[PDB]
Structure 1
């Protein structure tokens, strides 16, 4: 019960002998290759540590070390960004004129006429307009030169080497024992206070000493190459005192509890900076300060080696009621003896967080000169939404993996886990019904508007001009948060975001953030999102509940997670596994997220993004979302077809790379329909004829060529299908928004 560091000295030896023996990890693939399938198998089974061995000590050590490498490659990527933004970038030129200069940090070699990709991003630079929001991130970090980027890049590379070293050291040298990994109370206590709490406080230090004075001077008009370097603010109190008089007192107000005096670098203004169009840096500093105290205190809840504290096992068991049988008693062990259970829960919240971050960041642009960079905003919102949607699908997959691999019917008697597996046909049935309802009562009022418009009856349509369906509930929450600062949140000088309502923030004659108005089309598109979200959940949840068994095939648990079909009998049993419920829940995720990114792309270009002219603002599309989005044709004529002009006509210009990728993406998406619509039977025999030709000329390969497995073809098709569609939108969005 003692929380202590437990390690095993020099377990795995460091040698390349295993490197030369492909498949040493699997008993089955160690015997070498005899068919061309082994090649695809040694990759589809290299990270499945649970399959390699039954010891949970080794599986954990492998997982812990793996994560290290991941961090390493993340550092390498980050360091490369700073380096490319240090040597091959226009960051310094952009700093002087952020509005009229487009960010660029990728220069192509002058060959095969590919030098056309080096467009005039302005600022004596010819490169590729980036949409990663790094320039505005560095600006809000204070970075005012390419020597602070070069140093950072070097530091990231050094960290990378530490990460890989740590992975090898904590695997081949000091490998932690299982008892170490299963101290969840300790992990949470150190990840909440030490990682999140200190991580925010440490940032609240930079933001208060480097980012705030540098950004204030930059917004004051001071030349970037004339601002005092960051360290001078720390050492020279006079400089910081001039910018923030509260540094004349010192740390005395804090200890004297007179925090108020510091109300010049720690404020609750709210809204957006009128100069740069991004959340005040002062408010961000106060947020990270508060967030820190919260996390740091939260780190003192779970019990460790002393006495004070809580026992998550006891808490879960204590929470049981008159309807949920034994209650949460039995989940603690599941979540301290399974990596698939933990991963599933982690991915779900982590993925959902990514979407939530995208909504908040775009609504309240956190970086200077970010909202007026429309390409960056769009590229970020679309990105995080996908990155998150994928994780959620993974959460469903690993959940099913645990159910078919780590579930023990003995530990879960009357748990809320057995009591849910015991009513799966009520959960699934009701969810199926709501999906059908939401379907007809969301996509139907779109076909109805199409038919009524085509029949020349446009007064019999569902629009703000005819049968209206305004989102009243969403319209009231918008007003409770716009008039909140005057009542609910007095200390706040302004509302959290302009989206709720108010004036239009303009920076450089462009709309940084404009109050968004929700109408019939917003109501219609929002319910469309709900229908998709519900369906996606139905497919993944269905796979998890019946991952072990069902009226059709009452032994799936003994068949596995990645098994194609029980057989051609029972009227056909294809895609009965939980991998095939994840396979299909990916297409719906693409369908669900695609509409969301299209909804953001069109709504914004139509109702927010534009140029503030004398008396009025000119939106990218002249405010046509309301009347043009209630029909499916409007989504094709006024969105797809109309906005596709930039990408289809990008050839010959710096944006020509997107036109090429736009088509290339169509090819990949369509190519995927040869594996999603076909079957090995046809390819296997076809290969037999090819082998014959090879065996005639005596050029037949020693390894037996075999067609892709049933599950493999399903994976290859879905992979190319998602890659193609997302790539098409990536080219469309980027070339549209960068051109306009």
Structure 2
């Protein structure tokens, strides 16, 4: 029975504990004996599961901390709209969104950095942003900078609500544990009230703000004749010259929905499914129909689970009935117990939830990246080549960090919240009980793909060096065609069953070329041998990332080395130099190594993207129809030797960031060197250990004891785990800033 039960003023509101940091840990809250206490105060600030013990008080910290997080995002969202309001050329870019470059965030004249305020077209000097905010505000219906400014104001006051709601729900009315543990009611409101009503609300905006505004902006009315979005509703006659097949009145225009005469809506809720050829983005009428289909289908989804009115589903014994008197015969191997005791896993522990919710938010972010290039939803998005690359690349990296974090808390769940009694012989226990057959076969497929993806690049690298291009894995030598992916590219373009979609979704699949401002918005992306080989690099690097991360989850509890690895904790350096050496046996140390493999995998994904667009998709169209790509078919022939990657992609395409001094791209030249420093700097922490460094402090503490200037916060070299965390935080920081600088210097030097 779902009920709202809360406490009344559980935690007082005072600065008593601000003046005594480290209060959350009893070991931290007794004095700063060494500098290790300083670092422990930050590595433990958010591990609420070690501050207290009861799930009621832990969950109140989680729920209140989310509010302060939503406040931070609203501060950041406000900053985006405020900069788009009074520090941008957004007004100029609305008039001519081809020759004007998008730019907010101008630069102050000090230190000679005014050179970064490059020319943007229209006499505006700033930095060419690649975040795609402008392409999104045009699709939202923004026309002037007052609407942007008042949204920034509307976000700051919205952040203040998030801060108040977090203080209110920790210090005034904190919910009890019964309010948290009804996840079955939370799914109803998140599926229907949040995702269903959210996309119902948005399709309300699309039809009444975005569809009319982008209708007139495609006819060139130049921001005078654009009515303000409310003047489309106060003047309903104004939307009859547009979409005349509807009626557009308060009551008289809405009744086709209720009387089910939905044919009057066919002019603004279309199912065209292609790219709007004047802007290159998706048809907003086709987008508005999508959100209405999504809204209807999510509100329906939110009625699946059973709250206190009897009707609905119960997750508890939908799980408990996945035993094996009742499965398909070929997958009846998962236990007589099956899934029993697994609803208590995903309800009594937040790390179990965080592991799944991160691994799916991470996978969603990578799926989103793949979908926002192959079918750009925003006007003039696809032609801004610097935004297409920087939006795909941002969301692949964001999606890959989240996936590694889903494997972190899958391992923190094991060594902190895993309960053997509720998990006896069930689906989770039967995995730990054969975890050597899972890792043996993962370590074999990781190794099968390693030879059959990378070592074929060393075959090609050697035949082309010998001068035997006819025995290399080329399109001209030994062809490796992606047979099953060229088949799908044929399936997805002949289905235009699904007959109503007369325009092919995703010109990437095939058919037609869209050129908007002369630049190609989207072309078919054909797959040859170079795409067979690069896709098995992706399979290989994803698998080893899975192998590193899954090994840390399965062997988090114990191993054949250390049968009591769970008592040592989640984050321990080692178990001594015995057994030959047990360095990095913790589950944390498999997250630390999986971060490197995430870096390797995703930096190969964004390199596959960046080169394949420049060679096969992007480019410019002349007065005949031929397409001259940015690198000109370079991927097909020279991406098959990893000498070709080094000269035709890394050496060749870094010309824009190398020769960027004394120009407006000067800051990408410094970031590109800055990323190189931080990567090399990381290797100090990765290759060395803290015995050398601690013994070096002793010789430096002596020089301070001599001059009577020693501190009482005794200088200790960083922990073993801390030193490994510093190493991976800098390797990933430095190795990404250098890629971020290289991508954007290359594509803001072109367009």
Say whether the fold is shared (TM-score over 0.5): yes
Q: How many angstroms apart in 2 are the aligned matches of 1:390 and 1:225?
A: 45
Aligned length in residues: 737
User: What is the correspondence of 1:315-714 to structure 2 with a 5 Å cutoff?
Assistant: 315-321=318-324, 322-325=332-335, 326-485=337-496, 488-615=497-624, 616-714=626-724
Q: Work out whether 1:147 is the aligned partner of 2:146.
A: yes
Q: How many angstroms apart in 2 are the aligned matches of 1:183 and 1:241?
A: 48
Aligned residue number for residue 261 of structure 2: 258
- Point out the more displaced range, 145-154 or 216-225: 216-225
User: What is the correspondence of 1:53-72 to structure 2 with a 5 Å cutoff?
Assistant: 53-72=52-71
User: What is the correspondence of 1:158-197 to structure 2 with a 5 Å cutoff?
Assistant: 158-197=157-196
Residue 493 of structure 1, CA deviation: 2.1
Spell out, residue by residue over 1:615-636, the C-alpha distance to the aligned partner (whole angstroms, 9 max, x if none).
3111000111100111001101
Spell out, residue by residue over 1:54-103, the C-alpha distance to the aligned partner (whole angstroms, 9 max, x if none).
01111100000001011001000000110111001000100111000100
Q: What SS is found at the alignment partner of 1:690?
A: helix
Moved over 4 A (4+): none
Q: How many angstroms apart in 1 are the aligned matches of 2:32 and 2:61?
A: 25
User: What is the correspondence of 1:206-355 to structure 2 with a 5 Å cutoff?
Assistant: 206-248=205-247, 250-321=253-324, 322-325=332-335, 326-355=337-366
Residue 614 of structure 1, CA deviation: 2.7
Q: How many angstroms apart in 2 are the aligned matches of 1:510 and 1:24?
A: 59
Q: How many angstroms apart in 1 are the aligned matches of 2:56 and 2:114?
A: 53
- The TM-score normalised by the length of structure 2 is 0.98
Residue 123 of structure 1, CA deviation: 1.7
Residue 246 of structure 1, CA deviation: 3.2
- Point out the more displaced range, 251-260 or 241-250: 241-250
Q: How many angstroms apart in 2 are the aligned matches of 1:298 and 1:239?
A: 36
Are the counterparts in 1 of residues 98 and 380 from structure 2 also a CA contact under 8 Å? Answer: yes
Q: How many angstroms apart in 2 are the aligned matches of 1:122 and 1:589?
A: 39
Q: How many angstroms apart in 1 are the aligned matches of 2:211 and 2:429?
A: 54
Are the counterparts in 2 of residues 240 and 247 from structure 1 also a CA contact under 8 Å? Answer: no
Q: How many angstroms apart in 2 are the aligned matches of 1:223 and 1:460?
A: 59
Q: How many angstroms apart in 1 are the aligned matches of 2:468 and 2:298?
A: 59
Q: How many angstroms apart in 2 are the aligned matches of 1:375 and 1:522?
A: 23
Aligned residue number for residue 732 of structure 1: 742
Are the counterparts in 2 of residues 89 and 105 from structure 1 also a CA contact under 8 Å? Answer: yes
Residue 509 of structure 1, CA deviation: 0.6
Q: How many angstroms apart in 2 are the aligned matches of 1:318 and 1:225?
A: 64
Q: How many angstroms apart in 2 are the aligned matches of 1:681 and 1:228?
A: 70
Q: What SS is found at the alignment partner of 1:724?
A: helix
Residue 250 of structure 1, CA deviation: 1.0
Are the counterparts in 2 of residues 204 and 286 from structure 1 also a CA contact under 8 Å? Answer: yes
Residue 549 of structure 1, CA deviation: 0.3
Q: How many angstroms apart in 2 are the aligned matches of 1:682 and 1:253?
A: 78
Q: How many angstroms apart in 2 are the aligned matches of 1:209 and 1:450?
A: 58
Q: How many angstroms apart in 2 are the aligned matches of 1:368 and 1:519?
A: 31
Gaps in structure 2 of 5+ consecutive residues: 325-331
Are the counterparts in 1 of residues 81 and 149 from structure 2 also a CA contact under 8 Å? Answer: yes
Residue 544 of structure 1, CA deviation: 0.4
Residue 489 of structure 1, CA deviation: 1.3
Q: What SS is found at the alignment partner of 1:331?
A: coil
Q: How many angstroms apart in 2 are the aligned matches of 1:432 and 1:418?
A: 21
Q: How many angstroms apart in 2 are the aligned matches of 1:112 and 1:433?
A: 56
Are the counterparts in 2 of residues 509 and 612 from structure 1 also a CA contact under 8 Å? Answer: yes
Residue 453 of structure 1, CA deviation: 0.8
> Alignment RMSD, CA only?
0.7
Spell out, residue by residue over 1:185-240, the C-alpha distance to the aligned partner (whole angstroms, 9 max, x if none).
10000000000000000000000000000000000111113211111111211111
Q: What SS is found at the alignment partner of 1:293?
A: helix
Spell out, residue by residue over 1:2-39, the C-alpha distance to the aligned partner (whole angstroms, 9 max, x if none).
20111101011110110000111101000010111000
Are the counterparts in 2 of residues 107 and 128 from structure 1 also a CA contact under 8 Å? Answer: yes
Are the counterparts in 2 of residues 23 and 32 from structure 1 also a CA contact under 8 Å? Answer: no
Are the counterparts in 2 of residues 237 and 247 from structure 1 also a CA contact under 8 Å? Answer: no
Are the counterparts in 1 of residues 673 and 738 from structure 2 also a CA contact under 8 Å? Answer: yes
Q: What SS is found at the alignment partner of 1:658?
A: helix
- Point out the more displaced range, 692-701 or 221-230: 221-230
Are the counterparts in 1 of residues 246 and 264 from structure 2 also a CA contact under 8 Å? Answer: no
Are the counterparts in 2 of residues 328 and 415 from structure 1 also a CA contact under 8 Å? Answer: yes
Aligned residue number for residue 328 of structure 2: none
User: What is the correspondence of 1:99-114 to structure 2 with a 5 Å cutoff?
Assistant: 99-114=98-113
Are the counterparts in 2 of residues 372 and 510 from structure 1 also a CA contact under 8 Å? Answer: yes
- The TM-score normalised by the length of structure 1 is 0.99
Q: How many angstroms apart in 2 are the aligned matches of 1:45 and 1:682?
A: 26
Q: What SS is found at the alignment partner of 2:552?
A: helix
Residue 247 of structure 1, CA deviation: 3.4
Residue 597 of structure 1, CA deviation: 0.3
Q: What SS is found at the alignment partner of 1:594?
A: helix
Q: How many angstroms apart in 2 are the aligned matches of 1:447 and 1:231?
A: 63
Residue 721 of structure 1, CA deviation: 0.2
